[model samples]
Structure formats: C-alpha cells, structure tokens
Target: VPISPIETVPVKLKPGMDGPKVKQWPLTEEKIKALVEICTEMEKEGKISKIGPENPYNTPVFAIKKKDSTKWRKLVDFRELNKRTQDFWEVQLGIPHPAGLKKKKSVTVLDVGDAYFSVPLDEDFRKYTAFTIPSINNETPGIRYQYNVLPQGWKGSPAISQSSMTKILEPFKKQNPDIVIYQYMDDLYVGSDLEIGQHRTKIEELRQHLLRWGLTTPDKKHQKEPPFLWMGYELHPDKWTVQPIVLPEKDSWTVNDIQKLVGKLNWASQIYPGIKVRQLSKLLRGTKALTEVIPLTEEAELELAENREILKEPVHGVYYDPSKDLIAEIQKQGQGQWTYQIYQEPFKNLKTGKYARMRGAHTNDVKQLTEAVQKITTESIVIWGKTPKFKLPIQKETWETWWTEYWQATWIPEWEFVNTPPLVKLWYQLEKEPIVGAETFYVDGAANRETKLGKAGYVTNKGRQKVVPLTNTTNQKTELQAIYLALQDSGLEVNIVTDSQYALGIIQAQPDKSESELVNQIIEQLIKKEKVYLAWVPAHKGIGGNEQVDKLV
Candidate 1:
C-alpha cells in the first residue's frame, strides 16, 4: 500500500531516557522459520526494511500461534520503547457508538485492509521499532529489520492512523452530506435515509474515491446492506442478534482466557444493554494471577452459561432519539448494588414509552448513579419511591437541614415523582474470611506517662510497619490519630484492625457526635475508599497484629 499524504508526527523520548535493544526470547526452529517468512512478506509489501545491526534502539520480535490455526503471527515487544517516548497530543480513538439511527433506511459496514500501514512512520522514529531474527543453522548472521510504516505494537499507531484516515476522507465526507458516517480505526459504517440500491451506489463511489487516495477495502468484507455483522453483532434496523461464536475450549483457563470470553459477552450485551454484564464480575474475582489456571467456581460457571444462553436469542436494540424525554430509573439489585437504567420514552407516558432499555450496570454507590443521570439528561425524569435515601444520616436536625439546603434543591427536585418502590436499607456484611487481595492493618497508640509524648503506629499482616510520634495528645486522641494515620496510609480497599474501641466507635458514629477535626478527616478518607472494614480487638490479648503494633508504639 502506498503511504497516504499525511504528516507523521515524531515522538520525543523522555528527558534523560533512551530506548534499549531488547533481546529476543527463545523460539523453536519452526517459529524462527515462520518469523523469517513473515518478515520477508512484510519487506516485499514495503512495510519494513533491513537495517544495520548498530542501531541505537531495537525491540524484540516473537511469534504467537494464531487461535485455532497453525500459522504464527509476528508481534514486536515495544514495551521499553513505549515507556521512553513522550505521550502524543490528546489522542482519543475515534469509534462509532451505534446507539440511535433506527430512522436511517439502510446501513453499510466497511473495513480498510492494512489501515495502520496506510500511514507512514516518521523516519527518525523508525530506529526504535527495529527488531532482529536469529540466524538459522549458524549458516548466516541474524538479520535486523525496522518498520517503514506505523508498526502494530507501537503505542502511537491507533491515534496516528485515525488522524490520517480522517484527513484522507475529509473531502469525501464533505461531498456526501446526506450519509452519516462513523469510523473506528480500520472499521467504517455508513448509514442514510436512501434506498438500498442507491446506498450501494454511494458505497461504490466512496470505494473508488478511497482507492484513488491509496486506501483499499476488501470486497468480501464490505457489507452493502443491513443484517450487517458489525462488531460481532448481526445488526438490523429494528433489532439485532449476536453472531454465535464457538468459544475456545481449554483444559484449564487463565485470566486472559476468561477476559476474552467476558469481552465477547460484553459486546453481545450491547443489543439489550443492562445489568447482565455485572454478573460477569464474579468470573474476574479469582483472576489475580495472569498465567495461573483459575479453578472454575460453581457461581462463575452458572453465570457464564446464563449469559451465553441469553446472547443466543435475538434482542431489540434501543433506538435513541434526542427529541424524546429520557427517563432514568435508579434500581437496587441486591443490598449494596444499584443500577441506573435510562430509557427514552414518549412524553409523560410510561405505558407506550417502554420501547427500549438503554444503559445500566451494577453501581454500589447511589451517588455515582445520580451523577451519571445528571450527565445524561437535564430533562425532568420520573423516579419511583418516596425520596430514596442519599445515604446521609438524618437523626440529627443539622443533617436534615444540610440535606434540604445543599442536596435536595440541587439533586432531588428535578426528578418528578411517581409510584412507590420498596427502598432497601443499605447494609454491610463482614465476611468470615478476609476479602480477596485485602490488606489488613492493626493500629495502636501509646502515651508515654513520664514525658507525655504520644506515639501512633500500625503493622500490616504482610510485615509492613510504620510509627509516627505525636505531640500534645491524650490516650483517646492518640488512638484516633493512629487510626487516622493507618487509614490514610493504606490502599483504596483495606481491613483495619484496631485495639481501640474508642477510635472505631468515633469513626462509625454519626457525623454530629464526632466533632473533632481529625475525626472528620478520617471520615472523609473512609468515604474515598472503595471498600473499608473496621474491626475492634482487645488490647494486651496477645493478638499478633495488635501486639506487633503495640511494640512499635
């Protein structure tokens, strides 16, 4: 493919940084042969060229067996090079969201073959993309090769290629004003309110135009009519169905394997979007180790099977119209989890407007759902129930006043009320076992009776420990300080075990009762964490973490 007439921006390396020559990993004789053949093909296609061995930088190349095929796909490990290079200008991948557009009569999907290769790489930057292949049978020296065009593994490829494609198609887009076009890297979708034949003619004209600009589309891959297979979904005007994919079977599945399956299921869920994808989160919980085989739990297997069965049947796609009022319903799935379901409905009529269920996922915090709702639509929305608790404490008169003044007018007034949905009280259950990947810390404090100099300290279950001295503090204040320091020092999700019941009580107490500034700060920190579990264990009881922390203080 000829390089499109687009400027290739050069990426500068970080200050005092240089790219390294990464040694290629071990490869079998067959893999080496395949790599050589692929390199030869790329060189012939004008995509790469042989380079001298004394280059400043070189990344390693390896071959991975393609799924369900004996053929090998060459992949360059550009991780080191990527780390050294400066990030390019705000490079958002331009992808199409096929949400609304049901009004359009026909849709055409097109794929550009070798999209990245269409744009040439900056000449100076090519040095870092250099790769080597070991010699076969010791008869010849290893060959060094570098890319002439944008290579696949480079971090900048997608953004650079997208900009080039947009620039090339600018004139055509101007000419075809009636056609609504969307492009995501190599993939392009065209839709319009025209007859199918006319649409085909437009597509042909566009194809010829792209050819003139040195971009070619494979004839077999282009879809000129609806029932189009776009992004794994067989899409139609009014409805869509998931293209049944025979998932790869493995004796033992890794995190990568499960992730691949989840990706497919997630793509399929785009047809009838909602909380179903949230069920897939269970499968990801035990996937901490990347290469290690994850034992399939009963819950995960059941969820996997349920999702697969759901995707097999065709589902109606939500048709979004900006003119129609959008109704956002805040739904609680279980105790802590909630979902915000947005639906575009007819004006003030709930009965006829249930045409589509647009977007939803399990959100544990209601504040997130409300924030999302605010961003989505400003129009007056109908909500169920008698003022869902925003989780703010209300036994105290000040909190009620705070809600009315700060929250109620700003957040609640917009939602037009209707129907009563049973509001569930938010509750937390302390699991018998430590949560997966949770860091446990034991906090303690001691006041020196002679000097009156207080000290606070904490010890982790994994042996990480820290101690900080405090000035002008009582036993109670020191305990609170220790808890504060530990909470601040720990990660987003932690299990805090403390010997001081006084500190735990102050933390879990109502905001009004805990008037100390330190207590307020601790509360704020707790709110920021995704998950926090506080437990009280008696002091001098010889508890391992507590005893260790006590010694530090």
Candidate 2:
C-alpha cells in the first residue's frame, strides 16, 4: 500500500458536544483473521495505528465477503460520524462520466489501489475514526485502532480521494494534452488514438507519475484494450453492454439478496438510461427486516424478469452534448399508471447519443409526485413566467392551479399592495343621523380560526337588524360579506358604518373594477342603491350599533 504525502484538513464537525459512540460488532473467527490481515497491511503502509481505548469516539467495524474474491473486506459504520461532520454536507462529488471516451480508438481501464488511503489524515481528527477489535490472544484485552489515513466508509472520503487524485494528475494532464483521462475517484479511464505499443508506453508513463505521487496501479490489473470494463459496464467503440451479476432464484429471495440484485441492476441502468430499477423496491415491500425471507409475488417476479431481459441487451454509450436537447416525457398508461422516457438527440450524429427507450410503468401517487417535485427543485433550474399568466378559473382544483397560487405568493411581486392608492373619499358626517332622517346601518364580521366559524351582521338605526352565519370564511371574507349584505338590503339614501378599514379600502380603491366574485356582486349592488354613505368607525369603544353587531356576529 502506497500513501500520499498530501494530508487532508482535520474533519470539520457539526456544532455539538455529542459524537459517535458505538459498541464493537461481534465477529466470526474467519472475519477476525481477515480483519487482522487487513489491519496488518494498513499498519505496514502507515495507514492506521493503535490508539488508546479512552478515545472520545468509537465506531463499529465489521468485515463482509468481497464480490470478486473470497477474501473479506473490512468496513466501518461511519454513518453516525458522518451525521456529525460538516464536510459530508458541504462537499460536492461530481463523478466524471466515461461516455465521452467512447469515440477514442483505444481505452484502458486503470484502478488506483488503496485509493482513499493514499490521502493522509490530520492527527487531530484521527480519534474520531477509532474502532475496537477483539484481541487475537485471549490473555490480553481487546485493542482499539484508528485510521491515520482517509477511511473507506466515511461519507466524505470519496470527495477527498477524488480531489487528491485530481491534484496528483493535473500536472501530467496539462503537459500531455494528447492523452484523454476521465477519472472518477479510484477508477481512471485512459483513452488515446495511438498504436498498441504507444498506448502501453503512455499508460506506463502515467503510472510512473502516479507512483511519484504515492499512488500505485495494481500490477496486470489494467485492461489495455477495447471492451474494457469501466464503472460496471463493458465499454466498446460502438456500444456498451451491461455485465449483470448473478441473482438468487426467485423462489428463495431474502431481503439482503434482493437488495444486492437491485444494487447491481441500478448500476446497469446507468447505461440503460431513463429506465428505473425502482420497481424492484416493490419486491421487498412487505419485508420487515434484512434477514426476513421475502415472498416474491407474480408481479414482482415479472418485473425482475423484464429487468433481466433489459440488462441482457446492449446499449449505445450516450455521450452528452450540451448543445443537444435532453427531452423527458411521461405518458399515462391507465388511471394511475404512467411511463416516463428521457433521451438526448438532434446532435451532429443523431444516433450517437440517442438513449434506449424504457417502458416500465409506475403508479402515479400524489405522494410520489410531491416527492418527485421536491427532488426536481434541487437538480433543476426552474424558469418562472412573469407576464401573460395563465389565469386559473374561479373554482379550480388541480396541481398546477395550486402551484400557480404558491408561485404568485412566493415569487411574483405584489404591486397592488405596494402602490395602493388611498381609499375613495366619502363625505364625513360627524353628527349621528336620527332614525326619523336617513337610515344609518352599522355592519361587522367575526371569525375564529380554531373553530373555523364566521358570521356577518348589520344593524340599522331604524331598529332593523340582520345576522348571517357564514362557513369556511376568513376575517377579510366576512368583512367583505358584511358590506355586501348591507349594500344589498339597505334602502335608498342610507349611511353604512363598518369597523374594518380593510373592507372600506378594498371597496373604495376598486371603484372601477373588482378583484373577487363577491366583490363584483357587492359593486353591482352598490350601483343599484340610489345614494350610499360609507363611514369607518373604531371597534369596542362603546359605539352603540357597532358593539351590537359585533355581539350579533
């Protein structure tokens, strides 16, 4: 194992006193031996060292069988530690796609051995990566260990590894512009148009540079030819094929077994583009635990078979061209089922980047749509319309109608309120009108938010009083309603007083037009009245009819 001299800054922790503290996982004898072997190698490479048991943090460590080999790979459960690290939240890991290299004459797949461990760790943060292991000798107590280099299971390790590798490779890349290298963390795809010998020489030269930076390429592990395996896909000049992993028989599926199958199919779907392996999630729908024996339904079995058939076929490498349009379309298949397809086309060579069509249908649940939109916001640039707004109908119920309301409230400026003119002037008659003279009416509206009830009432100096019970109303709605009712019932040459200035302002400001259907109706009724005097009075100050209507409402 080779270690780079470049050291990462101390892990930035979230603002808290609590840190990860977990008990050691029980290990089998074989797993313990494997852990010891891996620890020994790491220690030799100066990647990890013994730490005291009094360290502030402890994370569980375990070993799992490697996919390609019989040996067990050691892994740490750093999920809790990741939750406490600011780096996990702040860092962005953008893996370079290998599609761009498909046009090259030859491609070589080279992997960096012990990639994350190449970058050294700051001593101050080493204690946070501590893990305990049972003692090989029963006579001694269990030992504690911590990584001196970047640990494999940490959430931010991939980003740190990628950054370090980029730094190490940048100089060579700049000096040799002829060689095209696309690196995603530990994996590097080298492509060129040179002869076989020349390509090998270039790879060797690149390996020398990696060696100088304390990174080693595994001996004889490099695939220096076409149809090379990169990122789980077998790459060729014409196309890429999915090399699917073996799945357990449908009759005997476990949660872990299905999880493994889904993982591989998802990786394969990267080249399959636009197709989702999500249907496989349904297979484990009723699964309560990882160890639970799952029963595969016919629908789930068919889904698995379809996914298998899709993976068996070859797919063209969809090299991205920003100039080309990427189109995504969703069509309804039935009442609640919809199928989506995404593709990029209309390039110089239209067929080059065309995606293979996927035909899987997903149930369109409102909950799932909500989740989909939430995800879309994070990854998409949403363009909002400023003018020529699609005026929604008066009483409408749909996704877009609600979204339009939300959009206007959120982004669109409220010029109506900001530049609102003073309310239309009304003649002020300070003296109270007698009952024998012009009839005066006082109106008020009341509403309770918790109880969801509203009432509007109006009282006249002529001993005429009316109260209207309203439902599903707000303070403003009730206020407007009270005014509307007063205008509708009052006789000619009348004076109407209201405790709400908001109602007065709305009615007076819009003398020419109205904003609501209720407002429109009130304006129409106002036109019918031969003469009306509008007045504003303060509330709860011993005003006779105002207080009376307040209690009535």
Candidate 3:
C-alpha cells in the first residue's frame, strides 16, 4: 500500500567480439562511436540531456569475467547516463513482510537471487572479469549494476536501477493488487502467510510476473523456509538479525575525543533554553594530577565538583515527583490512588504568576466559582430571550477594562497575549463620534415611479441614539435616492449624513458631466448654489445623532 522507492539495475556495455586476436583498439573505437551516435541522435531529436561535457575519464564503464569460463568482459559504463536520466519506470510489485500476513497462516518466503547483468568482454581480459548480465535485460550487452553507482561524482546510478526494476514489476502489481512487494535494488523479498496453499499460490503468481518481465528466482537463492535475506537484510518467519559480515568495524577513541565530546555537550546547553548546564560537568572525573597541571578556572572546577556529586548520588527518576503533600491530598480525596495525575493540569497563581497548586477545598471552590459565573451569564440572556439590556450602559469602558486586566494578569514569560475582540469593539466605538455643528438628513435615490427611494432622519439633542430603518418602494435604488433626498432637505448651511461614499464623492467633486439626470439636478442645487453639505459617516460607530438618523433612514 505504501509507495516504495524504485529499484534500478546498472546497464553494462561489452565488446561485441571475443578472442586472443581481437584488438583493444577495435573495442574502444566501437564503444566511443556508439556513445557519440547516441549523443548526436538525442541532440538532433532534442532529447539530449546531460549535466555537462562528457569527459573520457569521467565516463562510466567496468569489466567483469565469467565465474567458470575465466574470460575478461569489457562493458561500457552507463553510470553517468543513468544518473542524469529522469524517466523512471514504475512497477507495482508485491511485498509480504511477516507482519503483513494474517496470523496462524503458513507463509512461504522467497529470496530472489541478486538481479543479474551480462558483461561483454574484450578477448584478452575475458578470463579475469566474472560478471553476470542483469537477469531482466538479457538481450542487452550490459552487465547489471547496483543502484548505488554515482552519476558524476555520486549521483543518478541508484535511480536508474530502481526505475528499471519498477518497470519489470509493473504487471505483478496489476495481477496481485493485494500482494505487497518490498525491494532494495536487485535484492527482492516476497512472501505472504495466507495459508500453506495460499502462500504457494502468491509466490507462483509473483514468479510468473517476473518471468513475463524476463526475470527468475535462482534455484539456490530461492527459499520457502524461514530466516531468509530480503532487501539487503535478513528476515525470518519469526525474527531476523543483521548479517554479521556486514557489521562495521569499531573505531578507537582518545582523551582528546572526550574533550571534544564535552565541548559539544556544552554547546548544546548554550543553544537550548532552560538547560541545566551543571548536569554536563558531572560526566567527567577529576584527577588531582591533571587538575593541578592544567590550571582549571574557578567555574570549571565548580562544574567538575558538581559533576562528581551527581555521579556519587546518581538519583534515578526522582526529578519527576510532585510535592508529597499534594500527592497525599489527592489520595485522601478518594479520587484514585494518589499519583502524578493530580498535578498534570498546569496551574499558576493569579497573584504571583508562578506555578501553584489547589488542593482540598481550594480546587473545588474554584471549579464551582467558574461554573457559577458561566451559569449567571447564560441565565440572564436566556431570561431576556435576547441580548440583555444594559443599565446606564457604558459598554465600551467595561469591555476595555476586562480586556486589559485579562492580558496583564495572564501574561506568562515567553508568551504573548492578544486582546483581539476588545480591539475590534474599540474600533467600532471610535467610528461613531459626531461632527460638531453638523445638521444631518437621510436621502434616497430611486429608478422608477413604482420604485420610490426611501429617506428618513431624526433631529436630536443627545449623547447617543439607536439606528432607525428606512422604507422605500424602490428597494434596489433606496441607498442612492436616500442621499439625493437628504441633500435636497438640507439647503445651504446644511450638513448631510449618508452611508454611501460613492454618492458623497460625486456630490463633493461637483463633476461637470451628468451621468444621471436626477443626480445631476441634485448636484447642481448643492454644488453650484452651495445649498447643502454632505458628510460621510461609517455605518456602525454608535454616534448618537447619526445612529438616530441612521435608524430612521
């Protein structure tokens, strides 16, 4: 089900001929010519893709000999070309990890032999180079190479091999959609534990798929038994381990190495916040001879002493325990056996802003207080059947106080607090300020007789007022006609308020050209005669007079 990386096999090139009389010159000539032709044709067809010039020294090629025949085989190295090649051939193959099968079912594991590659050779070295052609590309003169070959210095070789193997397994995926295939280049391990009978059927299906793609499992390498090699690692029906032969050699360490290691530890302490630097010094043992000769600094000496104390005491898992009293209180509550769970939720004292605990009555009291506050607010609104009306509402001041106090007390070290809701409310409140000495009227613009624009307004001497809704036959053109009517009501020395900025801008500009006759007539009265003044106010600032006129309009 998971997409595995494609497996690639190296393409090996060899001299087409063999014999003692065969000259190396002919082999070289033929290989170079073939490469040149391939390059030239690709260039002509606009398919020539390469990282850079083809250096003879950098060209990939290797030699192999038959194991039994003792004959030298020369093959053109395709490592560079393969590295640069982007076209990956994909194939869905089956991989049956031991865990992939149903339990109690007998599974058969198959160790497919290393994919083979043929290496053609010049007659002279044919006896020395023993190489097998990749089992799938039997028709080609190239020997099979692993996916790890470097392209330039180290590049595309792995990709080429992977892509080729993917192509070889494509049909297997189509036929056995349920079977899982895991591969690491030429090494393939396939199996299924459906049942002894079902497992064999799965393996057969896989073998047929490989055969169709010109591949086969070698008799010696193929195993239905447990403990087999797959994807470069050993796998057993029950368990597996890394092969001993592939283990890496251990390297020697020196005193200087320990110093370098400690330096790294100190560096890590510096970069990570809240690191306990003293803990690192405990790792070293102080020698009187070394300390006397080296002339350690006071800080370094202190570190060494602390490190020694840590080593001597060697406290294990004690750092995580909460205060003893806190644990005891939790047990007394009969909630559960007292453990760290009681202290799991992080708490800080509001006064000190430091880690604090609430035990016994304190915790329960806070819980009840929080619930009661929520209940009071919920019931108040529910009883009113709407947002509750405020008495002598100074809503903005109350909201601002709540916003400021919440952030200040809750501000934690290295944390940021934002009062987004209060900031939005403040912005709304600020926009409602009324202009001094301004007389306001509402206006409407309509398109037809049936569609009469609505206009409404209220004259008020007040601090704040509610908004009034407008009514009009011409719902579509109400906003436009409202402004027009409002302007007409306020002759010269009159200040008009309307929600539409477009109408305000048009009236203020006093454009010479009239786009609408009705608008132009109103414009002429206000602009030419200076009969009315229009002031645009944003709709929701809660300015009392504007709110009143706004409500009427």
- Per-residue lDDT for 225-268 in model 1, tens only? 77767666665666555566555567587777767776766555
Quality of model 2 by C-alpha lDDT: 0.62
Q: Count the backbone clashes (under 3 Å) in each candidate.
A: 0, 0, 60
After superposing candidate 2, which stretches have Cα over 4 Å from the reference?
1-4, 26-34, 64-73, 89-102, 136-139, 195-197, 219-234, 240-553
- lDDT score at residue 156, model 1, on the 0-100 scale: 84
Candidate 1 is scored at a TM of: 0.53
Over 4 Å off in model 3, which ranges? 1-157, 167-171, 219-553
lDDT on C-alpha atoms for all candidate structures: 0.64, 0.62, 0.36
Q: Using alpha carbons, what is the TM-score of model 3?
A: 0.27
lDDT of 3 by residue, 414-532 (tens): 11222322121211111124445655454332234453545433343423222224544454345555555555555454555666666655544333335466555664455533334
For residue 544, what is the lDDT in candidate 1?
59
Q: Between 1 and 2, whose TM-score is larger? A: 1
Q: Residues 1-553, candidate 2: write the lDDT tens digits.
A: 5645675765767787566898777778778778888888888888898887678779998899977888688888999888887754334544334443236677677877465566787677787888877766544666678988888878777777777777788998899898898765467878887898899988999998887766667533444677667666666656555455656675666788778877776565545533344455665655568875666556667767776676566555544344444433223222223332233442221111112112222111222323332322322222111111111111223343433533223222111111112211221122234334567888888788877688887888788888889888888888888888888888766778888888877654433234477877876776676666778889888475778887674
Q: Which candidate ranks first by TM-score, i.e. highest?
A: 1
